[PDB]
């Protein structure tokens, strides 16, 4: 199937209390394999998956040096953003970065991603063409113009089309079955009486990987979006995921409703009923 590599950076300024906290996590698909945190005792890239532990000490030393430079870069990005938005120097602010590559089963690039948020809001994103920018507001336009003039997109394109793909391919080889697996959802429906005149149907999906899933209810084939309670997809702790969808139904009309599950691990989506 298809695969992604992503790095997620979080920087958080703390004025008068030293350098901003910088945290990176790295993912293949929904598997975290690395982390770096500037607050940790000896800040070092650390493994967080078994299949990346085989990398030698030079790999950890190298990535450590990279994150250390990244932390200083983000600190200066935060300084710059404060000016653009003309803000106090007294309060805390957040800069988030997300970048990586998607590859098809053939292992070639499908799509590169490179994008930023300031204080939880879109700031700037590299377009799918990897040659041009979408700025979220007039401040981001300042960043856009300096990046266009300096042709910094070309350097970002080289990482995403080149290295990003090579590292992902090597991590997929390292991981074998633990990354090429799709675990289908374990699915069932439970009935919970509310009154004489109403009952809750809860449709469950357990132990699925990857996290992407669609869980929906239908009344005789019709959408129940506004009448469906739907919990956020949640981790089990063992690198599988969980979800449920509930809908309050008039008692006796249970046969009218159907739960629909779509997941990579299901070639055909499931239709669960209550008879």
């Amino acid at each position: 199937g298809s695969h992604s590599m992503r790095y997620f950076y979080t920087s958080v300024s703390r004025p008068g209390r030293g350098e901003p906290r910088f945290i990176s996590v790295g993912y293949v698909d929904d598997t975290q394999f690395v982390r770096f945190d500037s607050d940790a005792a000896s800040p070092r890239e650390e493994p967080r998956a078994p299949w990346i532990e085989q990398e030698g000490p030079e790999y950890w030393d190298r990535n450590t040096q990279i994150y250390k430079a990244q932390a200083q870069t983000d600190r200066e990005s935060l300084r710059n953003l404060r000016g653009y938005y003309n803000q106090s120097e007294a309060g805390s602010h957040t800069l988030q970065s997300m970048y990586g590559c998607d590859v098809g089963p053939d292992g070639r690039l499908l799509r590169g991603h490179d994008q930023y948020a300031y204080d939880g809001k879109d700031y700037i994103a590299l377009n799918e063409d990897l040659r041009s920018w979408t700025a979220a507001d007039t401040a981001a336009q300042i960043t856009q113009r300096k990046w266009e003039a300096a042709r910094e997109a070309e350097q970002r394109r080289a990482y995403l089309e080149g290295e990003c793909v090579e590292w992902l391919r090597r991590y997929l080889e390292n991981g074998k079955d633990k990354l090429e697996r799709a675990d289908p959802p374990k699915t069932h429906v439970t009935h919970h009486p509310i009154s004489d005149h109403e009952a809750t149907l809860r449709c469950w999906a357990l132990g699925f990987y990857p996290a992407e899933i669609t869980l929906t209810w239908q009344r005789d084939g019709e959408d129940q979006t506004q009448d469906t309670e739907l919990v956020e997809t949640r981790p089990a702790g063992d690198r599988t995921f969980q979800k449920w969808a509930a809908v309050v139904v008039p008692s006796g009309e249970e046969q009218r409703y159907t739960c629909h599950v779509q997941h990579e691990g299901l070639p055909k989506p499931l239709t669960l009923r209550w008879e």
Binding site: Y7, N63, Q70, N80, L81, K146, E163
Partner: peptide
């Protein structure tokens, strides 16, 4: 591995 090109916003 993480990218070793850096960019100031």
């Amino acid at each position: 591995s993480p990218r070793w090109y850096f960019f100031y916003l």
